[PDB]
Amino acid sequence: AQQERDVRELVRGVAGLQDEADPNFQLALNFAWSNFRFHRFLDVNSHKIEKTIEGIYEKFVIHSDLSKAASWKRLTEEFLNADAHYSILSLLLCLSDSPSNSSYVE
Amino acid sequence: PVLSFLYRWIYDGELEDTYHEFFVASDPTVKTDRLWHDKYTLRKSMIPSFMTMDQSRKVL
Amino acid sequence: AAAAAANLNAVRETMDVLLEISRILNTGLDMETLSICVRLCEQGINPEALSSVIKELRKATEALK
Amino acid sequence: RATNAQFDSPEILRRLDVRLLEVSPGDTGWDVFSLDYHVDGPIATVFTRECMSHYLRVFNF
Amino acid sequence: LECSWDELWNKVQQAQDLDHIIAAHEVFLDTIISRCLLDSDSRALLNQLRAVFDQIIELQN
């Protein structure tokens, strides 16, 4: 119930389509739900996620960005204390996997 | 006996005791390259007073 | 009550932690869409599929540019 | 094999091998490459891994 | 790499203990950490260095 309203709002937000009576809204929504129901991925591996987080930290320490490394460790360790964790992490990871390296001024 | 235990650590260099009578505290729980840095540490209570600190540190 | 507001406080705290995660990782996500996807994840939804849809709708709004 | 590096010891040549960085897709093709000289021998006791990391940082500069 | 190489080369080539070899490596690396702009204090200098690297790739365009 809330799930459906959420998929509507996700279409509105990311796609920039604020009018549900646009046919493009319904097409994007049908696309979104058909993508959700096309089960084609393995379930999230928490250990692989953990490895990726740790490696991100190592890349920060290698590039002498210590404020970013300290922030990265601190934020990830706090977030991992109270499955869905690793889910959201992988989500963000894939989402913009470009390089995204500068992002300074904590 | 103390002087026997010293030459068990110079001419032997393998320490093995079930009682604390020597000034080295070996760690037989792991090490393979951290052996040098951590496996043997100074027990600071079984140094006698006819052995100065310099002597004990160097024998370790 | 009081303990029903303390939970809403700690939840927003963890969401703020993730909001700082999003800016230092230089991810394009905002507070609103993540507030959408959390309530999505409460029923359980695969983040691979969430990422696969957001990568398309983000590429449908550079097409409106 | 082409240059003067060839004559040098097989030990150190064996210990020199490539590594790569993370987050590769978004082009940044110049950030991705690295040299990691790996140490696992008895001499790891004198060439500790936290200084191996430092060598990578100075390589990067 | 000529001052620091000389410092390292002395305190290894004499060194009568393996620990002196070790404590020679440590300081030689940390001196290089200080001479390069890699400290928790010299961030501000490095920041300007990145902007002096930016205009090089800009001019190419």
Curated annotation (Swiss-Prot), chain A:
Places the protein is found: Cytoplasm, Cytoskeleton, Microtubule organizing center, Centrosome
UniProt superkingdom: Eukaryota
Expression tissues: Widely expressed, with highest levels in heart and skeletal muscle and moderate levels in brain.
Self-association and partners: Component of the gamma-tubulin ring complex (gTuRC) consisting of TUBGCP2, TUBGCP3, TUBGCP4, TUBGCP5 and TUBGCP6 and gamma-tubulin TUBG1 or TUBG2. TUBGCP2, TUBGCP3, TUBGCP4, TUBGCP5 and TUBGCP6 assemble in a 5:5:2:1:1 stoichiometry; each is associated with a gamma-tubulin, thereby arranging 14 gamma-tubulins in a helical manner. Gamma-tubulin at the first position is blocked by TUBGCP3 at the last position, allowing 13 protafilaments to grow into a microtubule.
Family: Belongs to the TUBGCP family.
Task of the protein: Component of the gamma-tubulin ring complex (gTuRC) which mediates microtubule nucleation. The gTuRC regulates the minus-end nucleation of alpha-beta tubulin heterodimers that grow into microtubule protafilaments, a critical step in centrosome duplication and spindle formation.
Protein name per UniProt: Gamma-tubulin complex component 5
Organism encoding this protein: Homo sapiens
Gene behind the chain: TUBGCP5
From Swiss-Prot, chain C:
Shown part of the complete sequence: 11 to 75 of 82
Gene Ontology cellular component annotations, sorted alphabetically: centrosome; cytosol; gamma-tubulin ring complex; interphase microtubule organizing center; spindle
Biological process annotations from GO: gamma-tubulin complex localization; microtubule nucleation by interphase microtubule organizing center; mitotic spindle assembly
Entry similarity comment: Belongs to the MOZART1 family.
Protein name: Mitotic-spindle organizing protein 1
Signal peptide location: none
Keywords: Acetylation, Cytoplasm, Cytoskeleton
Function statement: Required for the recruitment and the assembly of the gamma-tubulin ring complex (gTuRC) at the centrosome. The gTuRC regulates the minus-end nucleation of alpha-beta tubulin heterodimers that grow into microtubule protafilaments, a critical step in centrosome duplication and spindle formation.
Organism encoding this protein: Homo sapiens
Compartment(s): Cytoplasm, Cytoskeleton, Microtubule organizing center, Centrosome; Cytoplasm, Cytoskeleton, Spindle
Sequence intervals crossing the membrane: none
Oligomer status and interactors: Associates with the gamma-tubulin ring complex (gTuRC) consisting of TUBGCP2, TUBGCP3, TUBGCP4, TUBGCP5 and TUBGCP6 and gamma-tubulin TUBG1 or TUBG2; within the complex, interacts with TUBGCP3 and TUBGCP6 to form a luminal bridge with actin that stabilizes the initial structure during complex assembly. Interacts with TUBG1.
Domain of life: Eukaryota
Swiss-Prot record, chain D:
Domain of life the protein comes from: Eukaryota
Localization in the cell: Cytoplasm, Cytoskeleton, Microtubule organizing center, Centrosome
Expressed in which tissues: Ubiquitously expressed.
Assembly and binders: Component of the gamma-tubulin ring complex (gTuRC) consisting of TUBGCP2, TUBGCP3, TUBGCP4, TUBGCP5 and TUBGCP6 and gamma-tubulin TUBG1 or TUBG2. TUBGCP2, TUBGCP3, TUBGCP4, TUBGCP5 and TUBGCP6 assemble in a 5:5:2:1:1 stoichiometry; each is associated with a gamma-tubulin, thereby arranging 14 gamma-tubulins in a helical manner. Gamma-tubulin at the first position is blocked by TUBGCP3 at the last position, allowing 13 protafilaments to grow into a microtubule.
Functional description taken from the UniProt entry: Component of the gamma-tubulin ring complex (gTuRC) which mediates microtubule nucleation. The gTuRC regulates the minus-end nucleation of alpha-beta tubulin heterodimers that grow into microtubule protafilaments, a critical step in centrosome duplication and spindle formation.
Similarity comment text for this entry: Belongs to the TUBGCP family.
Protein name: Gamma-tubulin complex component 3
Swiss-Prot record, chain E:
Cystine pairings recorded for this chain: none
Superkingdom of the organism of origin: Eukaryota
Compartments reported by the entry: Cytoplasm, Cytoskeleton, Microtubule organizing center, Centrosome
Tissues showing expression: Ubiquitously expressed.
Subunit structure: Component of the gamma-tubulin ring complex (gTuRC) consisting of TUBGCP2, TUBGCP3, TUBGCP4, TUBGCP5 and TUBGCP6 and gamma-tubulin TUBG1 or TUBG2. TUBGCP2, TUBGCP3, TUBGCP4, TUBGCP5 and TUBGCP6 assemble in a 5:5:2:1:1 stoichiometry; each is associated with a gamma-tubulin, thereby arranging 14 gamma-tubulins in a helical manner. Gamma-tubulin at the first position is blocked by TUBGCP3 at the last position, allowing 13 protafilaments to grow into a microtubule.
Homology family: Belongs to the TUBGCP family.
Known role: Component of the gamma-tubulin ring complex (gTuRC) which mediates microtubule nucleation. The gTuRC regulates the minus-end nucleation of alpha-beta tubulin heterodimers that grow into microtubule protafilaments, a critical step in centrosome duplication and spindle formation.
Name under which the protein is recorded: Gamma-tubulin complex component 3
Organism: Homo sapiens
